[PDB]
């Protein structure tokens, strides 16, 4: 159990979530949520373009 008492343990430790998608962001971790709308501005811009042509 040197890992629980390592003074530089926080130095070698990685964040809970690094990017918008990687491996250890799965629904039992409560780190990635579907309600966060990535590709939300693009949907609004596309819908505005549809309204413009119409």
């Amino acid at each position: 159990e040197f890992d629980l008492s390592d003074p530089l343990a926080l130095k070698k430790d990685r964040p809970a979530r690094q990017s918008d998608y990687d491996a250890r962001n799965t629904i039992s971790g409560m780190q990635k949520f579907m309600g966060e709308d990535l590709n939300f501005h693009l949907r609004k811009k596309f819908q505005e373009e549809q309204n413009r042509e119409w």
């Binding site: 629980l4 409560m30 309600g35």
Partner: protein, 427 residues
């Protein structure tokens, strides 16, 4: 070994149940068709706590899905994880509850409860030792609030010495979507005070508050609220599914929780919740978990804990951590503020420690707090109830189903004496 038969009644109940069962299938490594594809041998150990086994190596949930109209269970059947439930346990009615408690408790749920009791008996006696059941519903609806209480009552006169859990969702005055729900909430909390062993009061207002100020979600839907509820639903029963340095099953969080039989209304809370942009400024240590876990905004009930005295607090930690870190943080919390904790109990915090964390996570913990600040979740609903009942506002929809007006009077009287019960330890 120690099996849990999971029940759910209502739309809200079935949408929370889908999230919960997919979360448990995530934890135990179950694909959307039923089989196992995980990478650790620890996930098969107590997999029969929630699952059964069929031929061909198929794991099916021990779930009973109850509703009074077929569209909601058609919706959960066609979802991403609707192919894992055995279609026998899907029980529906034809005419809906109509957002009416009397309909679900006397008229349409009572003529459905026999088949559901048959299914409950068939699924709940295959197990060797049954720890207890589990219900997910809301008090603001009609079929979860009405027939769910009937279900609790009939599985209480038949299984007296088991564990009853209800992850009820009581309504909020600020976020209200039905004009009748004071009646339903009052008439259901009349039953939940003596038919249940633990009760977890969750508010939609508190979930929206979490999603707005903590998670910083742009568009929180009902799916994220069910995700946040199922987080704590999985967190409370993690020590009888996985090993730990200090195990604590469901019964240990009842003897060490309620000091008197009428005080079992808790409020959950999940500790490691972080926004997307605030992820790299976070250190995943025990003090950071316990100072976030005790925060007033992190409660999943909309009552401020700082208005009342804490009765007893749980903390079921998951992950690999040292023990006196937890034992000194829970002592620091009681020592810093001695006016928010009751004085006639010397230690008000129970520690539970598991080993296996949530998937892809270094460390996690959950909160179960019994407090005298929960009375303001009942004072508001009782005040709205007596605002409606003094003019007999919507009572023709209920008295026509065959219930007397004495029932509302005894329901509000028992809500009042529950409030006065929670008041005498506030001073």
């Amino acid at each position: 070994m120690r099996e849990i038969v999971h029940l759910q009644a209502g739309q809200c109940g079935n949408q929370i149940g889908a999230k919960f069962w997919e979360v448990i299938s995530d934890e135990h490594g179950i694909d959307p068709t039923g089989t196992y594809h995980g990478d650790s041998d620890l996930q098969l150990e107590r997999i029969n706590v929630y699952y059964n086994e069929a031929t061909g190596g198929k794991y099916v949930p021990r779930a009973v899905l109850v509703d009074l109209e077929p569209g909601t269970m058609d919706s959960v059947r066609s979802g991403p994880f609707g192919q894992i439930f055995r279609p026998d346990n899907f029980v529906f009615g034809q005419s809906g509850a109509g957002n009416n408690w009397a309909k679900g408790h006397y008229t349409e749920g009572a003529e459905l409860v026999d088949s559901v009791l048959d299914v409950v008996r068939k699924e709940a006696e295959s197990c060797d030792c049954l720890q207890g059941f589990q219900l997910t519903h809301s008090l603001g609806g009609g079929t979860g609030s009405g027939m769910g209480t009937l279900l609790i009552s009939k599985i209480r006169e038949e299984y007296p010495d088991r564990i009853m859990n209800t992850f009820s969702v009581v309504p909020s005055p600020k976020v209200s979507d039905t004009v009748v729900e004071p009646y339903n909430a009052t008439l259901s909390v009349h039953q939940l005070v003596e038919n249940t062993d633990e009760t977890y009061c969750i508010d939609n207002e508190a979930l929206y508050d979490i999603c707005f100020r903590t998670l910083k979600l742009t568009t929180p839907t009902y799916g994220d609220l069910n995700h946040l509820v199922s987080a704590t639903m999985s967190g409370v029963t993690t020590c009888l599914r996985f090993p730990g340095q200090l195990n604590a099953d469901l019964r240990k969080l009842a003897v060490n929780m309620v000091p008197f039989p009428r005080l079992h209304f808790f409020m959950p809370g999940f500790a490691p919740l972080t926004s997307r942009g605030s992820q790299q400024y976070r250190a995943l240590t025990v003090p950071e978990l316990t100072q976030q876990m005790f925060d007033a905004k992190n409660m999943m009930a909309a009552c401020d804990p700082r208005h009342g005295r804490y009765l007893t607090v749980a903390a079921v930690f998951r992950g690999r951590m040292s023990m006196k870190e937890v034992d000194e943080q829970m002592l620091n919390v009681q020592n810093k503020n001695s006016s928010y904790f009751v004085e006639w109990i010397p230690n008000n915090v129970k520690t539970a420690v598991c080993d296996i964390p949530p998937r892809g996570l270094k460390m996690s913990a959950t909160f179960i707090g019994n407090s005298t600040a929960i009375q303001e979740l009942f004072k508001r609903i009782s005040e709205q109830f007596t605002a409606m009942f003094r003019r007999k506002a919507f009572l023709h929809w209920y008295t026509g189903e065959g219930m007397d007006e004495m029932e509302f009077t005894e329901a509000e009287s028992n809500m009042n004496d529950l409030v006065s019960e929670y008041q005498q330890y506030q001073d």
